[PDB]
Design an enzyme around this catalytic site. Structure first.
Site, PDB file in Angstrom:
ATOM      1  N   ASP A 172     116.205 -53.621  72.334  1.00 46.24           N
ATOM      2  CA  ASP A 172     116.989 -52.547  71.728  1.00 46.24           C
ATOM      3  C   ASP A 172     117.716 -51.785  72.831  1.00 46.24           C
ATOM      4  O   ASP A 172     117.104 -50.945  73.501  1.00 46.24           O
ATOM      5  CB  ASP A 172     116.073 -51.628  70.922  1.00 46.24           C
ATOM      6  CG  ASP A 172     116.819 -50.489  70.255  1.00 46.24           C
ATOM      7  OD1 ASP A 172     118.068 -50.506  70.254  1.00 46.24           O
ATOM      8  OD2 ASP A 172     116.140 -49.592  69.713  1.00 46.24           O
TER       9      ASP A 172
ATOM     10  N   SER B 133     136.276 -48.283  73.187  1.00 46.64           N
ATOM     11  CA  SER B 133     137.108 -49.389  72.763  1.00 46.64           C
ATOM     12  C   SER B 133     138.559 -48.935  72.673  1.00 46.64           C
ATOM     13  O   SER B 133     138.858 -47.783  72.328  1.00 46.64           O
ATOM     14  CB  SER B 133     136.627 -49.911  71.408  1.00 46.64           C
ATOM     15  OG  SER B 133     137.502 -50.898  70.908  1.00 46.64           O
TER      16      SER B 133
END
Ligand SMILES: NCc1ccc(C(F)(F)F)cc1
Ligand SMILES: NCc1ccc(C(F)(F)F)cc1
Length: 330
Positions: free
Chosen positions: A35, A199
């Protein structure tokens, strides 16, 4: 040194991935959920309330000759989905794919939420975010990656998740045969303890690419892709019959539909998620309504590049003194 381990989807939908981890002496092998969105290594154990264990493999510290109780230390974690667990702390030897760390904090669950009890295939989590998020009190503990860093050939790990198929987590080296083209690296902010990056935009199917900054975290521990409402609305608008369902809790679409791909930007590079990766199947057995793999982050407070996005790429987690994330097509 290096390590390499195969990671395997837990079901037919790629809801999560498990990776075998060796704990203790002699080794007890548990299948852990790696994770990058959390920083605790915790396991089902012989201390877990017996009614909250249903098929999981448990860690038994009393059978490990290297286990030491960490006096007075406790832990308690709550995940963004409402899951939680808590317990006490041992230190022990932990090995991943041949890479060994001694003195790793192994957090032993005394209590777990129902979502973990019902997931018989996940024996625990191995956190790979930054150690500032570790929940051990009164003395914060380091992640497996942080403990291994000094001994790794390169201070990196890579995630190569498979679509309905096994994949690989590598520690300490970049497998140049696992991707095509070049790796594009992008800046990471550690201010919230996550692998957080920006992004550069998105496209839906064959549509025009929209240049727009999307701040989000690279999280192998989250199944879906959670993006701003404006982006997600633009995606599902191209799917005939798709709608946001309050009773279901997100966007659903007629199972007979073909989904368009989704492209996200990494600097000047483009990662394309095939439309088939966004299909998460019927909302209930026998239903002709299917659940979408791209959902709104508006309720969450942060954008999450979960497995849906990460499994379309070869991902480099560069834990150098200035950390970066690398993305390549594969
Ligand atoms: N995979 C761990 C995780 C869980 C929740 C969140 C959220 F929702 F708080 F962003 C991030 C990371
Ligand atoms: N994002 C961390 C995480 C991972 C798995 C689970 C589940 F599904 F096992 F409950 C919950 C939270």
């Amino acid at each position: 040194s290096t390590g390499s381990a195969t990671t395997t989807p837990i079901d037919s939908l790629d809801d999560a991935y498990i990776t075998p981890v060796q704990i203790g002496t002699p080794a007890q092998t548990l299948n852990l959920d790696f994770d990058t969105g959390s920083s605790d290594l915790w396991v089902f154990s012989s201390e877990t309330t017996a009614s909250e264990v249903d098929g999981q493999t448990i860690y038994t510290p009393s059978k490990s000759t290297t286990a030491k109780l960490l006096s007075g230390a406790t832990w308690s974690i709550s995940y963004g989905d409402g899951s939680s667990s808590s317990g006490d702390v041992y230190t022990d030897t932990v090995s991943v794919g041949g890479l060994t760390v001694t003195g790793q904090a192994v957090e032993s669950a005394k209590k777990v939420s129902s979502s973990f009890t019902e997931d018989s295939t996940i024996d625990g989590l191995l956190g790979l975010a930054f150690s500032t998020l570790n929940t051990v009190s009164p003395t914060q503990q380091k992640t497996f990656f942080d403990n291994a860093k000094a001994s790794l050939d390169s201070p990196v790990f890579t995630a190569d998740l498979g679509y309905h198929a096994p994949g690989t987590y590598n520690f300490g080296f970049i497998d140049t045969t696992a991707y095509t083209g070049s790796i594009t690296y992008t800046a990471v902010s550690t201010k919230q303890g996550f692998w957080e990056w920006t992004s550069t935009g998105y496209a839906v199917g064959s549509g025009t690419f929209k240049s727009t900054s999307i701040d989000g975290i690279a999280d192998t521990g989250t199944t879906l892709l959670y993006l701003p409402a404006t982006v997600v609305s633009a995606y599902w608008a191209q799917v005939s019959g798709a709608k946001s369902s309050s009773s279901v809790g997100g966007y659903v679409f007629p199972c007979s539909a073909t989904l368009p791909s989704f492209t996200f930007g990494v600097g000047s590079a483009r990662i394309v998620i095939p439309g088939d990766y966004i299909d998460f199947g019927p909302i209930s057995t026998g239903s002709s309504s299917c659940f979408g793999g791209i959902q709104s982050s508006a309720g969450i407070g942060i954008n999450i590049f979960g497995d849906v996005a990460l499994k379309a790429a070869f991902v480099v987690f560069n834990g150098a003194t200035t950390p970066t994330l690398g993305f390549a097509s594969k």
